[PDB]
Design an enzyme around this catalytic site. Structure first.
Site, PDB file in Angstrom:
ATOM      1  N   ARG A   1       1.324  -1.461   0.136  1.00  0.00           N
ATOM      2  CA  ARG A   1      -0.136  -0.289  -0.371  1.00  0.00           C
ATOM      3  C   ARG A   1       0.843   1.298  -0.256  1.00  0.00           C
ATOM      4  O   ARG A   1       0.962   2.104  -0.886  1.00  0.00           O
ATOM      5  CB  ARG A   1      -1.284  -0.097   1.421  1.00  0.00           C
ATOM      6  CG  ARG A   1      -1.769  -1.115   1.194  1.00  0.00           C
ATOM      7  CD  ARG A   1      -3.375  -1.193   2.242  1.00  0.00           C
ATOM      8  NE  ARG A   1      -3.453  -2.203   2.020  1.00  0.00           N
ATOM      9  CZ  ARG A   1      -4.449  -2.349   3.716  1.00  0.00           C
ATOM     10  NH1 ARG A   1      -4.866  -1.547   4.402  1.00  0.00           N
ATOM     11  NH2 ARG A   1      -4.973  -3.750   3.619  1.00  0.00           N
TER      12      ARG A   1
HETATM   13  N1  LIG Z   1     -10.751   1.087  -5.864  1.00  0.00           N
HETATM   14  C1  LIG Z   1     -10.426   0.383  -6.046  1.00  0.00           C
HETATM   15  N2  LIG Z   1      -9.084   0.413  -7.317  1.00  0.00           N
HETATM   16  C2  LIG Z   1      -8.353   0.106  -6.961  1.00  0.00           C
HETATM   17  N3  LIG Z   1      -7.382  -0.588  -6.174  1.00  0.00           N
HETATM   18  C3  LIG Z   1      -8.009  -0.726  -4.780  1.00  0.00           C
HETATM   19  C4  LIG Z   1     -10.013  -0.293  -4.212  1.00  0.00           C
HETATM   20  N4  LIG Z   1      -9.989  -0.198  -3.302  1.00  0.00           N
HETATM   21  C5  LIG Z   1      -8.830  -1.186  -2.631  1.00  0.00           C
HETATM   22  N5  LIG Z   1      -7.970  -1.436  -2.927  1.00  0.00           N
HETATM   23  C6  LIG Z   1      -6.928  -1.885  -2.757  1.00  0.00           C
HETATM   24  O1  LIG Z   1      -7.144  -2.717  -1.791  1.00  0.00           O
HETATM   25  C7  LIG Z   1      -6.501  -2.838  -1.031  1.00  0.00           C
HETATM   26  C8  LIG Z   1      -7.819  -3.062   0.532  1.00  0.00           C
HETATM   27  O2  LIG Z   1      -8.417  -1.175   0.770  1.00  0.00           O
HETATM   28  P1  LIG Z   1      -8.947  -1.070   2.535  1.00  0.00           P
HETATM   29  O3  LIG Z   1      -9.157   0.926   1.668  1.00  0.00           O
HETATM   30  O4  LIG Z   1      -6.928  -1.022   3.058  1.00  0.00           O
HETATM   31  O5  LIG Z   1      -9.721  -1.541   2.932  1.00  0.00           O
HETATM   32  P2  LIG Z   1     -10.002  -2.930   4.140  1.00  0.00           P
HETATM   33  O6  LIG Z   1     -10.671  -3.472   4.356  1.00  0.00           O
HETATM   34  O7  LIG Z   1     -10.120  -0.682   5.130  1.00  0.00           O
HETATM   35  N6  LIG Z   1      -8.494  -2.756   4.694  1.00  0.00           N
HETATM   36  P3  LIG Z   1      -8.310  -3.496   6.344  1.00  0.00           P
HETATM   37  O8  LIG Z   1      -8.422  -2.252   7.170  1.00  0.00           O
HETATM   38  O9  LIG Z   1      -6.652  -3.784   6.781  1.00  0.00           O
HETATM   39  O10 LIG Z   1      -9.408  -4.592   6.470  1.00  0.00           O
HETATM   40  C9  LIG Z   1      -5.696  -2.133  -0.830  1.00  0.00           C
HETATM   41  O11 LIG Z   1      -5.240  -1.366  -0.679  1.00  0.00           O
HETATM   42  C10 LIG Z   1      -5.885  -1.160  -2.333  1.00  0.00           C
HETATM   43  O12 LIG Z   1      -4.794  -1.870  -2.643  1.00  0.00           O
HETATM   44 MG   LIG Z   2      -8.240  -0.148   6.061  1.00  0.00          MG
END
Ligand SMILES: Nc1ncnc2c1ncn2[C@@H]1O[C@H](COP(=O)(O)OP(=O)(O)NP(=O)(O)O)[C@@H](O)[C@H]1O
Ligand SMILES: [Mg+2]
Ligand SMILES: Nc1ncnc2c1ncn2[C@@H]1O[C@H](COP(=O)(O)OP(=O)(O)NP(=O)(O)O)[C@@H](O)[C@H]1O
Ligand SMILES: [Mg+2]
Lengths: 466, 492, 312, 82, 82, 82
Positions: B355
């Site tokens: 990330r």
């Molecule tokens: N719209 C998008 N387009 C491209 N890549 C995305 C998108 N959304 C998420 N990703 C990829 O997927 C990963 C997950 O995003 P994230 O905002 O950390 O979700 P999350 O459920 O809040 N993670 P966590 O808090 O650790 O459970 C990121 O590292 C991005 O690289």
């Molecule tokens: Mg997150």
């Protein structure tokens, strides 16, 4: 009067008051500490003893150490003087710019607005996000839940949504970081200063920040959501405006509860949770609402543990929501972003009498074509596509094109997916998915719909492939 | 009434077993205050009750009887820290286990400290060089960042850590203090041979000199295993808080998890998901937050974390793995299906993402890795069909050609890390087509050949990418020169 | 000293000493019984009481019966004259062939080799068998998982391994039968004499047999793997050999320890197993490695439950 | 509930069906949308709405089904259909 | 020749007593010594040598499984026992 | 006295109310209907239960005798009508 520590287990402290025993929810102050260790009462154990849940680290506590009641629950600054400022759970500011100077203060514990105070107005909030605005669109002053397992796309979606709605907003915004990464604050703060929504030179500041990240002990993570929403409560009632409340992550509230419930002396419920999960969430969540005095649009990202949507935590959270946007790993691992499940996500607004019967009939058509594709997915899984009927072969081909046209390049996704971010107007989304449903594009390849804004860009994308 | 033993600074032990010792007295001990036993063994004061102190034993419970004299230390569980540990192997407490005398420790730090808040940080920017081609190009790690190594047992997890440790000698051999990287390897729940055979390997590579090893193996008491990561984490924070750059590797948290689950269940705390206690998320939350990149005002020091997780049969959705996904700033997956196939490092490119590590990559790498990630997904765009030779299309058959070469290139030998420019040179070879003709069976052989040639003959051309941090038009065309004539000369 | 029986519950016995208490893991001799009864101290309950786990049947026990602390853990005969002998968890000879006259007795418990005494060298124990040495080489002072039971000549492969280590490396072997079926014990006994490894006449024997039979309580099944390891540990350190240790079967050692933790009253971990599973495995498996003096290389027969490799 | 408007706006008295809608641990706003919905359809008049929403203490939510069932019992016992 | 019909039902009858004597419960509420309950019963069957008369006892335990699950705690016990 | 079960598949496939004709039952039955409803719904439930079965079994391409074509044609029409 003074109270003496008779027992210390984890973040759960036992204080004995010989004189005038302090009530439940009251904030206590520990003497003999370098920094303000607050204890919040949870119960009276009998024999002039109370049980409290700490608001910080309990290391260095002596059996005897004096404690002083403060004749009030935990108290924090509120109002416009908190905008552009970061504060912890107990109100102490943590952006090192001096203390927060106000006249008005509030308590982080409050009753939920009475039945009479509830609003009934239902109006759509465009986001510019296709999979959302079509199939589960949020409503102004409504409750928005972003469900998702580990690393599926919550914190990225809720950041895109800010960039979309929070920046182009007239009223004020409150962000509450609950039990997520600390750098996730250092990212948001520096990005927000950069965009102007937080102004350091003057006070045109539009967003208020409150944090209790995954470095904070259970007690702090347990009450830090309340801190944030109380800051939001004020801008709703005492000034009566359009507040935007953002929370990440709402799960850490019940998780933190899970962490102390054991030590509080409860008997464990399902999955070893707090038996009080039902109501712990209720009294806290019912505050985060639109009233007849003002409106709160609440976007709350919800961590799902072990991708288990039946875990008592994410499953109880549904009941509190107006719009549920569910992110799925399977979808994400198919390189579909936003990874929104287009059949598990629902909005209470999806009613032809609100969004319009034209919107409704395209959402119900897209869902039908996708449910039919999913129900054929067990036969194709063994046989392969070759074996389908000539009627079904088409529905598969469209549903797949739709699947990818539900994917979208976000503006916050730019700085790693290389593609220019996109917002799609609602008329373009409805007209878009109508044409795929109508069979106008049965000739374009599937990948031409992959990661594009408006439908006119699919046509452009298909021409490129020469 | 009294003229002898005190109850304010002394204990008695009412009962011992199940790991915990109920201590009588100790009236002025603290929460998480370190205590001593009559047998030299040390404990942590975890529980403070009206009639007893609950103490966790950092060693064998057999050494403690009812009636043993328990003494205070006053200091909240602290560990010896500083630079006098570099090249040493200590236990979870910080005592020398390599038999090379005691540490000359001039400083101490708490094991139970909080992570830096919002202001003392800044978004990672400095390159944490792994020395592995597949990582540094596709999954770029940055200094101050947390990156997860995750995968089933025996899939190369540990190897990614060590080659990264061996790699840092090329910087510590320099004099530039602002580009050096100090290492800490925390071994939990492993075999004592596995740790011992690792320090030997680190020595045979002149790596140990900038490395601290904390060892609490399978044989060690469960809380020793529990304490271990935090102890060494503080030893890392020292460099971070001094404006130096450090690296900690937790191998691994899954074994520290079962250790803490043992503690929680022996303590009789409510068994939850997979029998794990409610705070196994917290256990890894407070620890990995402590890896951080400080802003210049705070000294510009960074702690970079590589924690390890052992999945069971590829199950990432499991409780403990999902938690660590939700702690760390990115993951590296190691599929058994690529490892037991010959592809090493066995990194799943379609699942591993870093990330906050992109804007900490070398520009010269971005010039080659950007169109590598693009063509590798274009190959992973379902090329499982495989067997047909020349029975498919025209524009899609070259994507199958490119892929396998760009795949073979990412294969890399153990204990042999590569400078960033040495990487952009061999990646340049496939990413432009200068391997499209060559038989897939030979790409490995070609690398070693071409790689040691530019090491030997073209140090001038290598130094001119390194310094410029960019593949200049002048170097690009002088590199085209090198690959074309070498390829024609190449004997398959 | 002396202690009295305060409680008898199944295979868990409580004993109250007046003065000084036996440290955890010290063997206890129950007096006035027909045969020998050993109680292993597991806990100190307070009020000068210890909680012990029996290695034999706890029937006929009277509250108040005098129990003797042996001042040390469970001590067993070690030395060359333990070869060709069937031993049980407490050292007793169970082949009815007269008492084992060894000079030294060693306790079945002992800490794993220090970090300094470890072998930084990774070497190969040449077995003489081709399939093994070429494709799946044994690590000298390592641990090998043997899949599949009898019906393919498991017993043979073991015996040939005993022969070939004694031949090629001049190192003795130890068979520790955890949960040995008594029929299979008898059958394995004569199979070893009939083939040559056990010599009922002279001293040319190459194996020491320890039997933790099934009809023995969980205490005996959980600790016999140590009673075998300690006989093997003598030949590593005292005679500097490359030793060979057979455990059959390792799963019944895990289930033995699960039963004990279930008996003491510990809250069970995942899949019903003990909370101490990681260590219960670590504190034994880390004694099996290559030291400065010698090395023990262990072949372990594994039972996987529900053919589930992810099973703890 | 809305289908009962026919029977409740006519002469027929032993076809009258009275309504009890008991909400348990729900969102207050949701319960409010609901009672609005009924008042728009003018069915609210013959409808008791017992509410123990998510914000109410668990002991009250426990009791709410029973309480409405007593309110229904009044009709049940005194010659009416609920 | 002896036939224990059945050992699954003796296992239930034993379990009751332990649970009610308040011995710790394990997998499927079975005490620690339920393997030990059957291991000492079934080893008692043997074939003696002509030294001890040459007589023999032969055992036939019956185990009832539910849904064919032979990996249930009691069946897992007896499978290895025999 | 019976239940009404609703599925997301039926809901999203178009069928609203999304009632599962196979799983849901009514324990009072026709006795709870008007003699006008009974004249048209007297056998309809068990008819559609048999249709829902033969619908997923007849999708395997087997040539179908007009007697099972009759039940196929009737079942599609009556599902649309409800
Ligand atoms: N719209 C998008 N387009 C491209 N890549 C995305 C998108 N959304 C998420 N990703 C990829 O997927 C990963 C997950 O995003 P994230 O905002 O950390 O979700 P999350 O459920 O809040 N993670 P966590 O808090 O650790 O459970 C990121 O590292 C991005 O690289
Ligand atoms: Mg997150
Ligand atoms: N690049 C490589 N080339 C060849 N062999 C490798 C490579 N990396 C690892 N191996 C081998 O594969 C095995 C597994 O590597 P290892 O670093 O121990 O992964 P691991 O997941 O940490 N194993 P474990 O911790 O015991 O579950 C080692 O025995 C190495 O010999
Ligand atoms: Mg390893």
């Amino acid at each position: 009067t003074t109270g003496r520590i008779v027992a210390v287990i984890g973040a759960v402290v036992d204080v004995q008051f010989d004189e005038g025993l302090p009530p439940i929810l009251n904030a206590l102050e520990v003497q003999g500490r370098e920094t303000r260790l607050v204890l919040e009462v949870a119960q009276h154990l009998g024999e002039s003893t109370v049980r409290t849940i700490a608001m910080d680290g309990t290391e260095g506590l002596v059996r005897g150490q004096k404690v002083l009641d403060s004749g009030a629950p935990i108290r924090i600054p509120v109002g416009p003087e908190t905008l552009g400022r970061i504060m912890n759970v107990i109100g102490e500011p943590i952006d090192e710019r001096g203390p927060i100077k106000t006249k008005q203060f509030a308590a982080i514990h409050a009753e939920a607005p009475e039945f009479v105070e509830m609003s009934v107005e239902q109006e759509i909030l465009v986001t510019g996000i296709k999979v959302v605005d079509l199939l589960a669109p949020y409503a102004k002053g409504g409750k928005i839940g972003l469900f998702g397992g580990a690393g599926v796309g919550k914190t990225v979606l809720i950041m895109e949504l800010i960039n979309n709605v929070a920046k182009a907003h007239g009223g004020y915004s409150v962000f509450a970081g609950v039990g997520e990464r600390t750098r996730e604050g250092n990212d948001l703060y520096h990005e927000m200063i950069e965009s102007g929504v937080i102004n350091l030179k003057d006070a045109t500041s539009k967003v208020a920040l409150v944090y209790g990240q995954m470095n904070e002990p259970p007690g702090a993570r347990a009450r830090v959501a309340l801190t944030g929403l109380t800051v939001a409560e004020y801008f709703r009632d005492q000034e009566g405006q359009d507040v935007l409340l953002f929370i990440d992550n709402i799960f850490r509230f019940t998780q933190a509860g899970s962490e102390v419930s054991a030590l509080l002396g409860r008997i464990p419920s399902a999955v070893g949770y707090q038996p009080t999960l039902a109501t712990d969430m209720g009294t806290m969540q019912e505050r985060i609402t639109t009233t007849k005095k003002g409106s709160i649009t609440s976007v709350q990202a919800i961590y799902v543990p072990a991708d288990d949507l039946t875990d008592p935590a994410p499953a109880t959270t549904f009941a509190h929501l107006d719009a549920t946007t569910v992110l799925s790993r399977a979808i994400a691992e198919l390189g579909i972003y936003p990874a929104v499940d287009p059949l598990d996500s629902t909005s209470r607004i999806m009613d032809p009498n609100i969004v319009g019967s034209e919107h409704y009939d395209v959402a119900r058509g897209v869902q039908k074509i996708l449910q039919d594709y999913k129900s054929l997915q067990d036969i194709i899984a063994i046989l392969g596509m070759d074996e389908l009927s000539e009627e079904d072969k088409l529905t598969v081909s469209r549903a797949r094109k739709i699947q990818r046209f539900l994917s979208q390049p976000f503006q916050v996704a730019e700085v790693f997916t290389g593609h220019l971010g996109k917002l799609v107007p609602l008329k373009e989304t409805i007209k878009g998915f109508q044409q795929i449903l109508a069979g106008e594009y049965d000739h374009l390849p599937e990948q031409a719909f992959y990661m594009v804004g408006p439908i006119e860009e699919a046509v452009a994308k298909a021409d490129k492939l020469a | 009434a009294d003229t002898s033993v005190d109850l304010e600074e002394t204990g008695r032990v009412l009962s011992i077993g199940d790991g915990i010792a109920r201590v009588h007295g100790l009236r002025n001990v603290q929460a998480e205050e370190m205590v001593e036993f009559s047998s030299g063994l040390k404990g942590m004061s975890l529980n403070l009750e009206p009639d007893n102190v609950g103490v966790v034993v950092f060693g064998n419970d057999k050494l403690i009887k009812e009636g043993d004299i328990v003494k205070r230390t006053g200091a909240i569980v602290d560990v010896p820290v500083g630079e006098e540990l570099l090249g040493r192997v200590v236990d979870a407490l910080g005592n020398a286990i390599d038999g090379k005398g005691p540490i000359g420790s001039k400083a101490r730090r708490r094991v139970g400290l909080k992570a830096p808040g919002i202001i003392p940080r800044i978004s990672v920017r400095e390159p944490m060089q792994t020395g592995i081609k597949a990582v540094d190009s596709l999954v770029p790690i940055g200094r101050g960042q947390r990156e997860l190594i995750i995968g089933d047992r025996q899939t190369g997890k540990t190897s990614i850590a060590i080659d990264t440790i061996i790699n840092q000698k090329r910087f510590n051999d320099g004099t530039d203090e602002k580009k050096k990287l100090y290492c800490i390897y925390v071994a939990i729940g492993q075999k004592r041979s596995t740790v011992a055979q690792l320090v030997k390997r680190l020595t045979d590579a002149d790596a140990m000199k900038y490395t601290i090893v904390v060892s609490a193996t399978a044989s060690d008491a469960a809380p020793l295993q529990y304490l271990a990561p935090y102890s060494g984490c503080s030893m890392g924070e020292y460099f971070r808080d001094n404006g130096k750059h450090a690296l900690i590797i937790y191998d691994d948290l899954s074994k520290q998890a079962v250790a803490y689950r043992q503690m929680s269940l022996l303590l009789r705390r409510p068994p939850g998901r997979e029998a794990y206690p409610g705070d196994v998320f917290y256990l890894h939350s407070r620890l990995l937050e402590r890896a951080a990149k400080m802003n210049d005002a705070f000294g510009g020091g960074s702690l970079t974390a590589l924690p390890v997780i052992e999945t069971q049969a590829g199950d990432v959705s499991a409780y403990i793995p999902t938690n660590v996904i939700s702690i760390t700033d990115g993951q590296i997956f190691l599929e058994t299906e690529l490892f037991y196939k010959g592809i090493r490092p066995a990194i799943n490119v379609g699942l591993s993402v870093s990330r906050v590590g992109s804007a900490a990559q070398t520009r010269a790498m971005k010039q080659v890795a950007g169109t590598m990630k693009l063509e590798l997904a274009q190959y992973r765009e379902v090329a499982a069909f495989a067997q047909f030779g020349s029975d498919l299309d025209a524009a899609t058959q070259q994507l199958l050609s490119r892929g396998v070469r760009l795949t073979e290139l990412l294969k890399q030998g153990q204990y042999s890390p590569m400078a960033i420019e040495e990487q952009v040179a061999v990646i340049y070879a496939g990413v432009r087509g200068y391997l499209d003709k060559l038989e897939p069976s030979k790409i490995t052989k070609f690398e070693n050949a071409f790689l040691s040639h530019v090491i030997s003959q073209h140090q001038a051309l290598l130094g001119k990418i390194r310094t410029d941090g960019k593949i200049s038009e002048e170097s690009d065309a002088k590199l085209k020169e090198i690959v074309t004539n070498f390829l024609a000369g190449f004997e398959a």
